[PDB]
Amino acid sequence: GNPLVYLDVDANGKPLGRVVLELKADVVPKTAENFRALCTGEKGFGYKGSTFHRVIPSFMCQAGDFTNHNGTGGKSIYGSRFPDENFTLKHVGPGVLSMANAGPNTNGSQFFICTIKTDWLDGKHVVFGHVIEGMDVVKKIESFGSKSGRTSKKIVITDCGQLS
């Protein structure tokens, strides 16, 4: 069974609700396992308490920098970075979960929820899951973004974990 995980998200302390994600461990087991463990916090670090630090309406929500909270940090459960597992899953449309990176083989903990179908990102970012429930929460996060990515409220993953 592919893991189901959740992120409960706040905007300036007001609960926005829950995003439920399926991690495609059947396709990208190593990338799925990293995200799953960062959600449970079982390695002693992870996403709880961290933020969506970059949000661009009509494009994406970006999160996972739980060390520096600004896009420069994060780390994987394996070490600071780990390779691109494969590019089998594509950026097919809204709700896609994709690893952020700084070029080939630099996956860490940062990730995007992508709202756009684009062949240009295929083969550059590892896709590893999708939104099962809560796309309305994603659009509320989106509502607090801006062209630059700066958010107008502090968007916080107040709790996260594994459902199954």
Ligand SMILES: *[Se]c1ccccc1C(=O)Nc1ccccc1
């Ligand atoms: Se969508 C997506 C998925 C994976 C990586 C990056 C993106 C993305 O939309 N990036 C971006 C879009 C618009 C402006 C800045 C950055």
